[PDB]
Each structure stands twice: as structure tokens, then as C-alpha cells.
């Protein structure tokens, strides 16, 4: 007979380790520059979070500069991507919507749209 196992804590635990890796900078494979500020991250997490990054990463530069947002906004979207949670001042909502729109993060775009 067949056997089956399911762990509903895997997706979340997996993302948790990934964030822990990004904080220690372990196995990072891409550098995103934002206003002369370097961010080390994982292509896979970013590409699965944003269709914009999925497309962009087919260049294989391992290094990319973003001009549509400030390092603060990016750090804000990086945290969301790695923790599924975003913290931001009400005064940043516009900045986030503009970037979420370009990055195509449906959830951030939806929420920011409602909140405004
Ligand atoms: Mg800039």
C-alpha cells in the first residue's frame, strides 16, 4: 500500500531558515544595489516573490541596480519576501505601492491600494 506525509510547518520553516541565511549572508547569490546600498539575497526567494525578478535574473549578472525605489522601501519589501511580514510607516504606503506595482507583488499592491 501507499504512504503519505504532510508537514504544514515546512513552507513556513523553510522560509524561516532562508531569512536566517540572508541575515548571516550564507549562500547568497545576488546583490541588489539601491541608491548605492548593497543587499545580498537569494535569487530563488526574490524570483518566486516577484515576476519582475524572475525575468531579470535570466541575465545572470549576479548584480543588479534598481532605480524605482529607495533602500528603505526595498529593505521593507525584502523583509516581506523573507518573513511574509511587512512593517512600514503610513507615510511610506505610496512608495511601497509604486514599487509593489513594478515588482508585481499582488498582495502588497492589493493592500496598499485598499489602504489608500
Ligand atoms: Mg534611486
Swiss-Prot record:
The modification Phosphoserine is found at residue 70. Induction: By retinoic acid. It comes from the Eukaryota. Within the hematopoietic system, PLZF is expressed in bone marrow, early myeloid cell lines and peripheral blood mononuclear cells. Also expressed in the ovary, and at lower levels, in the kidney and lung. It is found in: Nucleus; Nucleus, Nuclear body. Binds EPN1. Interacts with ZBTB32 and CUL3. Interacts with ATP7B. Interacts with transcriptional corepressor RUNX1T1 (via its N-terminus); the interaction increases the transcription repression activity of ZBTB16. Interacts (via C2H2-type zinc finger domains 1 and 2) with RNF112. This is Zinc finger and BTB domain-containing protein 16. The gene is ZBTB16. The chain holds residues 7 to 122 of 673 of the full protein.
Amino acid at each position: 500500500g501507499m504512504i503519505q506525509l504532510q508537514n504544514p510547518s515546512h513552507p513556513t520553516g523553510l522560509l524561516c531558515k532562508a531569512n536566517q541565511m540572508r541575515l548571516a549572508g550564507t549562500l547568497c547569490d545576488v546583490v541588489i544595489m539601491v541608491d548605492s546600498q548593497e543587499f545580498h539575497a537569494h535569487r530563488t526567494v526574490l524570483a518566486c516573490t516577484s515576476k519582475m525578478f524572475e525575468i531579470l535574473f535570466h541575465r545572470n549578472s549576479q548584480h543588479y541596480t534598481l532605480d524605482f525605489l529607495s533602500p528603505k522601501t526595498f529593505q521593507q519589501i525584502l523583509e516581506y519576501a523573507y518573513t511574509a511580514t511587512l512593517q512600514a510607516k503610513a507615510e511610506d504606503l505610496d512608495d511601497l505601492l509604486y514599487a509593489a506595482e513594478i515588482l508585481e507583488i499582488e498582495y502588497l499592491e492589493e493592500q496598499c491600494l485598499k489602504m489608500l
